[PDB]
Write a protein that binds this ligand. Sequence first.
Ligand SMILES: OCCCNCc1ccc(-c2ccccc2)c(Cl)c1
Length: 326
Amino acid sequence: GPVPSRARVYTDVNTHRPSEYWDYESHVVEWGNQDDYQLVRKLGRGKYSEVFEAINITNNEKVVVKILKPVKKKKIKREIKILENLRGGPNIITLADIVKDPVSRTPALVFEHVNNTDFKQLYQTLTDYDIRFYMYEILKALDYCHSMGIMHRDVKPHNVMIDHEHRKLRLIDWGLAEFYHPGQEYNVRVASRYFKGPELLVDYQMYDYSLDMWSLGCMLASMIFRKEPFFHGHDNYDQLVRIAKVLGTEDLYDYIDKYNIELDPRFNDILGRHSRKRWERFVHSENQHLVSPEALDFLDKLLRYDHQSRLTAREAMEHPYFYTVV
Ligand SMILES: OCCCNCc1ccc(-c2ccccc2)c(Cl)c1
């Protein structure tokens, strides 16, 4: 079968901690008062959640209320435990309260409010410096959650809130996050299609924190090249073909050979043969002010088939691309 793998960093953080820490199924949840909060407006709608702007009527402070469709109790417990574990970490959304609606029997998570600036409006006003600054802020959040034995598994622009006026960034939506246990085989049906790492697409279940580093690389490539998304798959099989059109099919076979992965027969007639492209090929007149040899070098070290060969969040923070930031 497939060759086993483990993370290169923070490998045994959960193994050396008591059960209390990672055993979310045994975690005791305590509700606050739903009447402390008045809902203002709908902010968004997710697969299993509805997000609202609200007012905490006891202190007149704005909050964010994430109402969960209680589809799977185990998943709600997991997110609550993870949020509690990460509470106060750099650039991590702060869980402030957990409440329930007794009439509809519905749980809700209460967060610190984040004054998010528009993604489609930011995309053109941002400078080379701004990209470096916010990428470093996301890395602070990932290095922290990885050090806490947690993989986010859903890194994408929609899960990154930015209050540009105050240069404040928060990594949100911890509903797909999971505790990392070396040797564990995880469900590959995580992340959003465009941000899925090759390990997910070839159904390699023994993945780790490095998955988040692929997803971050997809975000960086889309920002510096002004191409959203960078890898535009139309389905999960086509997604690997879009990556192969950039990274080449040679390094893809080296990857699957290294881990003795069995490629699904659905890849037989669509994968084709593709040469390894130079990152310089994606530079155009519309994006050249955001591209530099340091950015390309950094990107090349993130977007690698081999999850083990990708930079960790800490190594990424030490890259020359971030020499200009504090
Ligand atoms: O409304 C949903 C939240 C959408 N957030 C907008 C947003 C704006 C900029 C970035 C970004 C990405 C790479 C480098 C620098 C900045 C991200 Cl990840 C997200």
